[PDB]
Amino acid sequence: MKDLYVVNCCRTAIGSFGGSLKNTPAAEMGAVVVKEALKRANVAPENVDELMFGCILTSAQGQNVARQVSIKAGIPYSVPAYTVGMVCGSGMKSVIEGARSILAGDSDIVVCGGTENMSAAPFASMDARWGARMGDKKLVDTMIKDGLWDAYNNYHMGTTAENINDIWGITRREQDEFAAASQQKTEAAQAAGRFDDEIVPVMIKVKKEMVPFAKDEYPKAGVTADSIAKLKGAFPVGPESPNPVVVNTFEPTGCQDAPDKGTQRVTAANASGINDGAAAIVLASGEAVAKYGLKPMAKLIGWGQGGVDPKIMGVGPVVASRNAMKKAGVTIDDIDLIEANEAFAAQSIAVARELHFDMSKVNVNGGAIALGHPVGASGARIIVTLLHEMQKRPEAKKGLATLCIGGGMGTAVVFEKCL
Length: 419
Prior knowledge:
- The longest helix is centred in the middle third of the chain and has 20 residues, at 172-191.
- The protein has 11 helices and 14 strands.
- The protein is α+β, with helices and mostly antiparallel strands.
- Strands 1, 2, 3, 4, 5, 10, 11, 12, 13 and 14 form a 10-stranded mixed beta sheet that branches. The chain has a two-stranded antiparallel ribbon with strand order 6-7.
- The radius of gyration is 20 Å and the shape is globular.
- Helix 3 packs across helix 11 and helix 5 (157-168) crosses helix 9 (345-355).
- The PDB classes it as transferase.
- Keywords: Acetyl-CoA acetyltransferase, transferase.
């Protein structure tokens, strides 16, 4: 009963940038998944003690998106809520914060998760308030600025991915095979309806009729490594060119030499996308599961965080997964299924070499290169996808979910399936 359980969880289908969910605000996407997750979990909204929700592109969305999600989902005014800002890890950080609240004795049921409408993030003028005076100024893209730009080195997350390519020695062909496998796996998962259970529909406007949006929009069919071998690079390499200078918070073991070192290898095809979507997780103590007769999907048996140099933020999961697995008392050989978010094939390859992933166990339904990456939500999204596939596989008894975080961190969670 001192244990922690995910009772149920679900996710929207993920929209393309400018696509089907562009007109569905983050708070509304969040409310859909929270109401549905409570429903499937058979938990009354008024028995929720707190809602914690990740969302980072909060510009002009009003006071406290998490509270907006909570109230719009039907949770009473008496239930507090707050917004979790940990860049791409926000949706998973909410789970860690919910778990801590329960273990501290402050709550027994916490709604966890995240939401992000990247399409809807606005442009900002820093000069308009007190005056431009004279001379052209900038309209800042808050999506790039707050979501995809490193605050300490003044370049894009894609340039940190090129840093990882140089330090770890990752060829362009390896990244393209990684991205091609991801699309191929998602195409197979979509043709099998593997996401049907975990997806909740969102009603969107198409002309004058409300229509359900319930299938992931971003995947591309017929993707091979060769077909994407001819794209140009999307990001500049780091100013430190083939030998970035970083401070290591762990000692890498999977570093090799590659012939394309110091050239553009990250492309639109081998990186994740910019996307819209949401995901919700109902977290409960054993006391709550027993008092309300709940039927949880899985026991949360460990969680972890990590910090790394911002220049190479994409290996955050290495520390975070190590901390979580040790709190769970397990090794990578005890893990049956893995969801390691595909921020970039560059960092995903590096993390897998460091953690000695068995690729046959990783992202078995494809990852964010195919499915998309709504930054504030994906940390919860990959948990949703992990737990549903474990539910499908009799033998998949322990799962790991982890993802990298802009600014140089990672989060990770380890689960044991319930039966």
